[PDB]
Amino acid sequence: PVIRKFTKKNVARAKKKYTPFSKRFKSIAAIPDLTSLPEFYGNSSELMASRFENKLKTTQKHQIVETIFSKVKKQLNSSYYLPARENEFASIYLSAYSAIESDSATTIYVAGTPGVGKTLTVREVVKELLSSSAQREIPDFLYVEINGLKMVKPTDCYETLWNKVSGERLTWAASMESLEFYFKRVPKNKKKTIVVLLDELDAMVTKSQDIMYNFFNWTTYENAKLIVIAVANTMDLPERQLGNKITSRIGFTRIMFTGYTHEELKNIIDLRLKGLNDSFFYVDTKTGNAILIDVRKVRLRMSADAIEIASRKVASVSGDARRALKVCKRAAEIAEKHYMAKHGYGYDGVQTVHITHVMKALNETLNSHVITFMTRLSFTAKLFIYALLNLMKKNGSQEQELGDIVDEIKLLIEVNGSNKFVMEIAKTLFQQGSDNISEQLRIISWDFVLNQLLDAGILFKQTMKNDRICCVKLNISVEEAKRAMNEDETLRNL
């Protein structure tokens, strides 16, 4: 045969066809009704879940103990009635209902900051629309959800949509022409409205505006019945991508989701804990199992001051809801740990949570752990930091040479040769305590402390093979290093 110049022995290719849709049913007048086909619109395909489920199952439960705080922790996750988001719900629902009722196409753009709750309210709107359609008030439709961060290649959207509307399996380009023909030329008497939910839109338009332009433009055609809802972080993202005139031609609806306040967040937290708060529980003393209404009758309380202070702190900085929920959950977890530790329980009066637990859980996310890290470092590393600070206090250049640091360390050692500690540390620092080792040039354990400081994210060193003129710089500002040095004793004194 032939001699290959290189080989690819780990190539895997999926079985997908190439011929687009506008070659199948011949003339346009020969297209049958697509509503009644058993493969179109997912009419009969409801067995994909059973293909891979029942694999992660096992048969054993050794009477898992459920402490009192377990219920509170379980009922406070980010998965388990919208209290604040009502205007956006009304606007989106009205737009979508008007679009569905009159058999038209439309585009809704939602922009916001993380944790506001845009996906939740969009899904709630979709559920309400599905219920209304099942009530036989508007023509039935299909709901397709497409995410942006859950795809390997960015151009995998097209085929997915096609695979959710036809049952075929084509490549991305052929899917693009198939979708174009389907949305343009198929008559409106043989289709069904589709509600796409393009999500994390900013992750698709990163090399070109092709996907966004196509998806937004497919709503312009008269024969199409598409209703696109796209959510994103930045508000004026399409303008920065497509252009003013194209956007003006398209004419979509725009909605902005502002952050939360310290009242709405507290309302959310209080709503998520209604039945549990101020209730009664039967608790077994031997094990610790708790049952909602020998054994004891106890109560669970959560101080409103703790909720208020947590909401006030969280809403001040970001406006999230996930972080507030997680803070409350962590406070409950700390209280549960203390309770089990005190009562000597294990895995398999009025118990409350005070403001102290919430404050302790809140301080863990704001404080930094650099000062504590340096107040426990070795003597040589602290000497290195001290020499660097001294050189910076003279040159004021923020980027020092390494040989200068070595010379400064040597001068500092040789000029204070009258203090007891540095008098008796010199031999262990230069000859490691033995009389058979010649006097070293740099220090004992130079590279070790250098790499220990450089790995932790405290120093920055440029790459040069000459190890005497390499430049290093700090990365934690200067006041923190000054505090860390001042907390010492032998370095403070000299």
């Binding site: 895997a12 290719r13 999926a14 891979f52 992660l56 199952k57 096992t58 048969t59 054993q60 439960k61 898992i64 377990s70 922790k73 998965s79 993380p114 944790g115 961060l149 859950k150 795809m151 390997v152 290649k153 972080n233 999230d320 972080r323 997680k326 962590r330 740990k337 895995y347 863990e364 996310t365 752990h369 890290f373 426990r376 070795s378 040589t380 040989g403 262990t428 620092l429 490691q432 305590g433 058979n436 080792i437 010649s438 006097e439 070293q440 040039l441 740099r442 004992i444 354990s445 220990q452 790995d455 932790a456 994210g457 405290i458 790459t463 093979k465 000459n466 190890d467 005497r468 003129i469």
Partner: protein
Amino acid sequence: DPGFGSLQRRLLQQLYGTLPTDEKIIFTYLQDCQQEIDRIIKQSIIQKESHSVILVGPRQSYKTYLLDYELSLLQQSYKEQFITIRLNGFIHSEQTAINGIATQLEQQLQKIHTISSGSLTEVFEKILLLLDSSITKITVVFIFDEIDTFAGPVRQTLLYNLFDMVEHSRVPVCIFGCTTKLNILEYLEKRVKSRFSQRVIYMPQIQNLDDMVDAVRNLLTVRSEISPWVSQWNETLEKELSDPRSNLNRHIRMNFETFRSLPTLKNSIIPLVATSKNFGSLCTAIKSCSFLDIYNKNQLSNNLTGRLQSLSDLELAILISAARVALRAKDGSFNFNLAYAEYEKMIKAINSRINTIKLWLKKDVKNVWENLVQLDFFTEKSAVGLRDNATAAFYASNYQFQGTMIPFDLRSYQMQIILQELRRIIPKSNMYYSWTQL
């Protein structure tokens, strides 16, 4: 006697840590981290609750050790209720991670009682359908290593999916990350950080000397009658860790003030106990600790000052001349011709002052110059060393630097040892000593 051999083998396998999990020993200064990690893992596995956590600490700070201990402890009472998947940030790119996850999932699921077949997108969608979605589920426990390489500034797509799996799923999931950066929370982007559980635990550090003493005592104490000598050895060590003037205490204090790391001391101790042939030899070696001095001396036998004492006369003279020439220059640069001119001037001065010292020719000094540049005494004018990653090296390997086109006599080198260090190191009896200062 076989008893001494058994004792030596037991000591060696105690030091390396290879020991049955039911009799392992854990240092007293990090038991709180053990209890915290054990509580997290027990909550995740026994009670079927999802968790995400990150461990931050310096290299060799007992991160993987504690996780392995916890998993081995839990893999003898509840073995049918969890599976483990480990990923390493150094040998797993953003594409091979999916294949590795699929393969390990398939293997573990088959062992407990396809997925890995197809293109990348098919595998990704299959694992997403599997995970993202009496009788209880099975917890998948992820173990990341060097998670800071998956949190770059470009995509961050795997962490988003995994944290979403932790947040919204019906299959309980527990994920542990490991990294050494102190500001890992600032590497994550907005959405990934929002989905994070905001739980970071910092590894403990040694604060006193009694902690190191207790760690050494725990390391070197046999607590099981297996040999006739175990009665005496356990006593002898107690006489060297109680006396504050013993050599072992001095070495421990030196390590505390210089390195402050148990693994270095462990590596130092291993050959000391593996070298002795008789029990008396072991006792006298642990009494005197004279082998640690030899070990330390060898460990410093190829540093900058260890090579300077293995040079011939001509090489030393050339080095001194080059340093003298480099001291006068503005930026420290020099080349071959100036160094040889200074060398010949110095030789002529030495000869005229006073047997005569031979003046080697240019072609014989060329070999000495190449030998010196090989031993890493000079470097080129402005040359970077080894690139950080592979792509940078590939880019640099396709460009012809100007240093390889200039002839030999005009390459501009730079010094790595200044003249003051030569003056400090070289003994005063050498006949070149007077020329080491201007």
